[PDB]
Structures are given as C-alpha cells and as structure tokens.
Design a protein around this motif. Structure first.
Motif, short mmCIF file in Angstrom:
data_model
loop_
_atom_site.label_atom_id
_atom_site.label_comp_id
_atom_site.label_asym_id
_atom_site.label_seq_id
_atom_site.Cartn_x
_atom_site.Cartn_y
_atom_site.Cartn_z
N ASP A 223 41.87 40.55 55.69
CA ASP A 223 41.18 41.35 54.69
C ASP A 223 42.06 41.60 53.47
OD1 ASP A 223 38.76 42.36 54.01
OD2 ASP A 223 39.02 44.30 55.01
N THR A 224 43.38 41.63 53.67
CA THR A 224 44.29 41.89 52.56
C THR A 224 44.22 40.80 51.50
OG1 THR A 224 45.73 42.99 54.14
CG2 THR A 224 46.64 42.53 52.00
N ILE A 225 43.73 39.60 51.85
CA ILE A 225 43.62 38.53 50.87
C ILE A 225 42.70 38.94 49.73
CG2 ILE A 225 43.13 36.09 50.55
CD1 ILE A 225 45.21 36.16 52.40
N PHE A 226 41.56 39.53 50.06
CA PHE A 226 40.51 39.77 49.08
C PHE A 226 40.63 41.12 48.39
CE2 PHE A 226 38.74 37.09 52.49
CZ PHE A 226 38.66 35.92 51.77
N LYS A 227 41.61 41.94 48.76
CA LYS A 227 41.88 43.14 47.97
C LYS A 227 42.58 42.78 46.66
CE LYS A 227 42.03 46.37 51.83
NZ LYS A 227 42.90 47.20 52.70
N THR A 228 43.37 41.71 46.66
CA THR A 228 43.98 41.25 45.42
C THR A 228 42.98 40.51 44.55
OG1 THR A 228 44.80 39.34 46.64
CG2 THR A 228 46.31 41.18 46.30
N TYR A 229 42.06 39.77 45.16
CA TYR A 229 41.00 39.12 44.39
C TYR A 229 40.11 40.15 43.72
CZ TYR A 229 41.82 34.35 46.04
OH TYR A 229 42.35 33.11 46.29
N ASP A 230 39.74 41.20 44.45
CA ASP A 230 38.82 42.19 43.92
C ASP A 230 39.47 43.02 42.82
OD1 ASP A 230 36.70 43.88 43.52
OD2 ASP A 230 36.64 44.68 45.55
N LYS A 231 40.76 43.30 42.95
CA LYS A 231 41.42 44.19 42.00
C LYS A 231 41.46 43.57 40.61
CE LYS A 231 44.98 46.45 40.00
NZ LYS A 231 44.72 47.47 38.95
N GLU A 232 41.71 42.27 40.52
CA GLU A 232 41.97 41.62 39.24
C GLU A 232 40.79 40.83 38.70
OE1 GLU A 232 45.78 39.93 38.96
OE2 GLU A 232 46.50 40.68 40.89
N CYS A 233 40.09 40.07 39.54
CA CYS A 233 39.16 39.07 39.03
C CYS A 233 37.77 39.63 38.75
CB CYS A 233 39.06 37.91 40.01
SG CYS A 233 40.63 37.05 40.30
N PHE A 234 37.39 40.73 39.40
CA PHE A 234 36.01 41.18 39.38
C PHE A 234 35.85 42.49 38.62
CE2 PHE A 234 33.60 38.36 42.10
CZ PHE A 234 34.60 37.66 42.72
N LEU A 235 34.59 42.79 38.28
CA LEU A 235 34.25 44.03 37.60
C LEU A 235 34.29 45.20 38.57
CD1 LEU A 235 33.47 44.72 34.68
CD2 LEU A 235 31.11 44.79 35.42
N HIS A 236 34.54 46.39 38.02
CA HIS A 236 34.81 47.57 38.83
C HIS A 236 33.86 48.73 38.58
CE1 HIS A 236 38.64 46.24 40.64
NE2 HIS A 236 38.76 45.53 39.53
N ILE A 237 32.94 48.62 37.63
CA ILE A 237 31.99 49.69 37.36
C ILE A 237 30.59 49.17 37.67
CG2 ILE A 237 32.15 49.02 34.95
CD1 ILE A 237 31.17 52.05 34.45
#
Lengths: 55, 55
Positions: A40-54
C-alpha cells in the motif's frame, strides 16, 4: 666387518575442496505485522504528487 | 666382542595453502523499508538548490 648405507625419498602432494551451503528460515509474527503495508505504501507516493486533492 | 654404529639424517620440508571464500546473504524486512527514499532523496537536493520554489 659389515657396513651399509640407506636412502629414501617420500614426496606427497594433496588437494582438498569443500563446498558447504545452508539456508535458515525463521518465522516470526513481528514480520507479518511489518508485511501489511508494504504494497500500500507504493500508492501513497503516487497519490500525494500525481493526483488532485480537492473534491 | 661385537661393536656397532649407526647414523641417520632426516629433512622434511612442507608447504600448505588454504583459500577460503564465503558469502552470507541475510534477508531482513527492515532493509526493504529503507529502500524507499534511497533514489528519491537524490532529487530532493536537486530541487532545493537549482529550481524556482515560487509558482
């Protein structure tokens, strides 16, 4: 009157070779708990930088 | 009347040579966690010292 003489030559050459291998596996519960979030730790870095957050 | 004499000389020269090689490979789950930021921290020092930090 008796005389004598002797002579010897002993010559030995040797070779050794030993190949020792092993494999030890220890099972601990502490390793299973640390296993949980490795994938699961793989996709916490993907989500933090590559994707929208609002929303 | 009997008299005897006897001599002896020995001389042994030996040589040894022993070559040992080992490779102990240890698998710890902790060393896997420390793998994460190993490559990423390369470009955190690049970002701070070469690029503009304001939008």
């Amino acid at each position: 009157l008796r005389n004598g003489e002797s002579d010897t030559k002993r010559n030995t050459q040797s070779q050794n070779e030993m190949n020792r291998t092993g494999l030890t596996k220890q099972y601990l519960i502490d390793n299973l708990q640390k296993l949980y979030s490795m994938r699961d730790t793989i996709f916490k870095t993907y989500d933090k930088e590559c994707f929208l957050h609002i929303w």
